[PDB]
Write a protein that binds this ligand. Structure first.
Ligand code: FE
Lengths: 183, 187
């Protein structure tokens, strides 16, 4: 039997005790933002951190659960808001649940058949990501966007699909939050 | 097959209420034989039969890979000197885990393996508790204010209340000049 445990989550910083921390800078997201020059330019300026993750994951096993907070920093590549790489689940059939804790943003989701959805998130918002949907989180404000994600331990990852095909929409700013088609 | 639609629902940090969730209510009368002091229990039922806890749940069909979530508002109180608590259970599919996230108040979680090996983990706002596969678990309110938390669990986890209703937990959590976890006499 594995040992149960309790770890503290800091509502102000999003940091979880004993969690495994990972960092993703702009340089780690080549080809993700539509404006390549804005990207190359910002990177040369010492690619700032786009987001950090504090995760507690179990072995890949059916019925078990993983959890992690993400600190999505505010910013834009051109006029495209800072975002996570996003992905599909290796075992696409797994769902996910997000709980927004600080700041504001939204989640962009997509199905293999072409459907795309954008769900706005503010502190207290719980987003249910159904099985089969690819998803990415977006920070649409000027402050850090912090959220806790809970997902099946055997969900796995699938960035390739998005790495190539990607999402059918991009979220940018036109004096206001705008969701438009992607190329 | 249709693809279910994603959605966002608002959770109120102060009340524990989740918009569009299904509400369930458990009063002291719904927990017959759960507390050790049967006389204090019956006396409290007659005096008013207070609500022990309310649940606001958003559940999916019992399918593998899916997820359910629910908040619980566990009210403060004691039956004799035993703190208000949830009924407790093992998952129907015993190897499913669960994750708890405390939001308001103060309490703790009592867990035990099928054999009776127990653990007690304190919970305060911000505390995340990992309920591993195979462990039964029960939440306890050790404070004077409502203990509110969010639970996330597999849609096919299910609930085995029966085993706990029959044998209870190996330990009980009470107040004796302080919070104490001791052996459950009728365990
Ligand atoms: Fe459960």
């Amino acid at each position: 039997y594995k040992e149960p445990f309790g770890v503290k989550l800091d509502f102000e910083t999003g940091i979880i005790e004993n969690a495994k921390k990972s960092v993703r800078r702009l340089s780690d997201m080549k080809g993700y933002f539509i404006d390549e020059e804005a990207w190359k330019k910002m990177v040369e300026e010492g690619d700032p951190v786009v987001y950090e993750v504090y995760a507690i994951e179990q072995e890949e096993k059916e019925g078990d659960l993983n959890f992690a907070t993400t600190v999505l920093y505010p910013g834009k590549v051109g006029n495209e808001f800072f975002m996570t790489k996003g992905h599909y689940h290796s075992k696409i059939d797994r769902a996910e649940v997000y709980f927004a804790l600080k700041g504001k943003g939204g989640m962009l989701l997509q199905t293999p058949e072409g459907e795309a959805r954008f769900i706005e998130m503010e502190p207290g918002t719980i987003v249910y990501v159904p099985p089969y949907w690819a998803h990415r989180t977006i920070n649409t404000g000027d402050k850090p966007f912090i959220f806790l994600a809970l997902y099946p331990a055997d969900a796995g990852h699938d960035y390739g699909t998005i790495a190539e095909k990607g999402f059918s929409k991009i979220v940018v700013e036109e004096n206001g939050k705008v969701v438009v088609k992607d190329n």
